[PDB]
Design an enzyme around this catalytic site. Sequence first.
Site, PDB file in Angstrom:
ATOM      1  CD  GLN A  20      -2.668   5.844   9.912  1.00 29.66           C
ATOM      2  OE1 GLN A  20      -3.617   5.372  10.537  1.00 29.66           O
ATOM      3  NE2 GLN A  20      -2.359   5.460   8.679  1.00 29.66           N
ATOM      4  N   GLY A  21       2.500   5.947   8.776  1.00 26.07           N
ATOM      5  CA  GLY A  21       3.889   6.281   8.527  1.00 26.07           C
ATOM      6  C   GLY A  21       4.811   5.132   8.843  1.00 26.07           C
ATOM      7  CG  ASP A  22       5.209   3.478  12.581  1.00 24.49           C
ATOM      8  OD1 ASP A  22       6.286   4.068  12.465  1.00 24.49           O
ATOM      9  OD2 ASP A  22       4.442   3.602  13.559  1.00 24.49           O
ATOM     10  CB  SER A  23       2.682   1.230   6.269  1.00 22.14           C
ATOM     11  OG  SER A  23       1.416   1.299   6.874  1.00 22.14           O
ATOM     12  CG  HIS A  39      -0.486   0.412   2.480  1.00 18.14           C
ATOM     13  ND1 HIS A  39      -0.299  -0.457   3.536  1.00 18.14           N
ATOM     14  CD2 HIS A  39      -0.209   1.642   2.962  1.00 18.14           C
ATOM     15  CE1 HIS A  39       0.061   0.245   4.603  1.00 18.14           C
ATOM     16  NE2 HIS A  39       0.139   1.517   4.291  1.00 18.14           N
ATOM     17  CG  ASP A  53      -0.220  -3.796   2.815  1.00 15.39           C
ATOM     18  OD1 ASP A  53       0.333  -3.366   1.786  1.00 15.39           O
ATOM     19  OD2 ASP A  53      -0.557  -3.065   3.764  1.00 15.39           O
TER      20      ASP A  53
END
Lengths: 235, 59
Positions: free
Chosen positions: A182-185, A41, A89
């Site tokens: 969020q941002g750690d994905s 993603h 993902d």
Amino acid sequence: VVGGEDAKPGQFPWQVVLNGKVDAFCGGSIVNEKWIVTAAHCVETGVKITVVAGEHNIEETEHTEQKRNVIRIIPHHNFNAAINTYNHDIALLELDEPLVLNSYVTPICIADKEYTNIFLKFGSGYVSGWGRVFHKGRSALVLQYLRVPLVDRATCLRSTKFTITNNMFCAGFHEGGRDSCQGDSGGPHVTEVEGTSFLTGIISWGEECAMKGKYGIYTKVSRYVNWIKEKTKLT
Amino acid sequence: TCNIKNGRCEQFCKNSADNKVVCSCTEGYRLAENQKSCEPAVPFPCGRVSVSQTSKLTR
Ligand SMILES: [Ca+2]
């Protein structure tokens, strides 16, 4: 990462940060000198991405940083086969020039399907990244890390209206307060086995962050290690 | 057998013959002399911290 702590330089030498149309937008882990594994993603077929290994503080210079351009992106073939499910993902990024391995730039180990699952079941892993440190708050300057417990499948299933597939697992605390965000994905969920860290998951999605009764959802790497090894061979 | 404590193997175990085991390691490591432990076979093996950390000890 919400409720975590600052990493020490070189503590997670496999961790990389991805920069693009948005700075420090996702993480990844070093597979070998030419390949990074991240979340699909994060890499919307199309835009240009840069990878920085050996990174610690995003606003300072440590002289350990190695920047590379991504020349090829391979999202898992079944990602987005359905819409908005977050299933499969995971994606691989090929670098233009090989990373130079050292104490700050080191690959994460990847076991076979059977052992990756055995390691995940130990029940305790680390997640890290430069993402939000507060739900809807600022992103981290210094790499953050957090130990998170594996959550049994029924509680997992029972915690959300969204479908948790067999290619995913839940991790986090019953009381909330600590979670990836969020941002750690694309960053790694790793399991340390007698001093050696193994990739057990990919930070993938969740509902808000660190809320009580909710857990972080991770891509189950055991289901994808054969694919990672087929695509990342060096010649 | 691999049933108990991973066959005493630091990393991977596989049952062999007559209830015995064969240990193996991941890429970058080699099976040591004792047949159980995994030792680095390259300068920067995967999954390990080598900055070691801190600057105030016997080392
Ligand atoms: Ca820096």
